[PDB]
Amino acid sequence: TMEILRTENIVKYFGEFKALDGVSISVNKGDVTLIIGPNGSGKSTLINVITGFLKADEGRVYFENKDITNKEPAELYHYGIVRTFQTPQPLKEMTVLENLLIGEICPGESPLNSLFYKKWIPKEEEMVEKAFKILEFLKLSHLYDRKAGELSGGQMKLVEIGRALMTNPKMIVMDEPIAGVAPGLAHDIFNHVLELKAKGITFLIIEHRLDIVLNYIDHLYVMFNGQIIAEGRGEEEIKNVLSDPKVVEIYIGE
Ligand SMILES: Nc1ncnc2c1ncn2[C@@H]1O[C@H](COP(=O)(O)OP(=O)(O)O)[C@@H](O)[C@H]1O
Numbered sequence: 001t002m003e004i005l006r007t008e009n010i011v012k013y014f015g016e017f018k019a020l021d022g023v024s025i026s027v028n029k030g031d032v033t034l035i036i037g038p039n040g041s042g043k044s045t046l047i048n049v050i051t052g053f054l055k056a057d058e059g060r061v062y063f064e065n066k067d068i069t070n071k072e073p074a075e076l077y078h079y080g081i082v083r084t085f086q087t088p089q090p091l092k093e094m095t096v097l098e099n100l101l102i103g104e105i106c107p108g109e110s111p112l113n114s115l116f117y118k119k120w121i122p123k124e125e126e127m128v129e130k131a132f133k134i135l136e137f138l139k140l141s142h143l144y145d146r147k148a149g150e151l152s153g154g155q156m157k158l159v160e161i162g163r164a165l166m167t168n169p170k171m172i173v174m175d176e177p178i179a180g181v182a183p184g185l186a187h188d189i190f191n192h193v194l195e196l197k198a199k200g201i202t203f204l205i206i207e208h209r210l211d212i213v214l215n216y217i218d219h220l221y222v223m224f225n226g227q228i229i230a231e232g233r234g235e236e237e238i239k240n241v242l243s244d245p246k247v248v249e250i251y252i253g254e
């Protein structure tokens, strides 16, 4: 079992505010890693540093040991690191298939980036074969021509994961993919995550808390004030963590 991603004492300031105070995490290939913590604890910031949206002021980030510290999304895409993005409104006017194909212009970048650089949605062989192979995986093949806006919220979320898959990634990073969903949808999204894990794909996900999808998590990290305050590897440890007095205290009123 090998480590696929590690961060070493990542520090990030926003003015005089230290958002990340020396965060060192480790993700192993295939692990569904979840980072939780109260709002403002620095989870999105950590992920933004790891995925090229923010530079680390101090610290190193390694993907397969290759120092990827501070590389933009366009470069990280070549390394096999992708991020899921929320679907912009205009993409909801495009078909499910177009939603998967538009990522070939600005690969690994925000959909707005791709949507604004698009002359005509690419329709090449290997591309369409990839898209349809992904639609089969998500069991959304018959929806290929349906406008993204007419999909259920949950089907739209699967399509967002589908876009990330277009880039044939090694690691998919998701910032709060199941925020606000009902238990059934949370299970649905996470069932597909498990299926993707079986194919060797690694997941680094952020969620506010952990409950419904508890048994889907291989590795857990709890953040607070830009620092890692707890960690669990495995069902029992993860359950210990969630019941940790100090962990529930940071959740008073949240
Ligand atoms: N781009 C930014 N510029 C200035 N402050 C930021 C920026 N991004 C995040 N912050 C601050 O960092 C802290 C939280 O980090 P964030 O990643 O958003 O937390 P979380 O994802 O855990 O809710 C907050 O105090 C937030 O206001």
Ligand code: MMC
Binding pocket: 074, 105, 106, 107, 109, 117
């Ligand atoms: C990178 Hg267009």
Ligand SMILES: [Mg+2]
Binding pocket: 043, 044, 045, 175
């Ligand atoms: Mg956040």
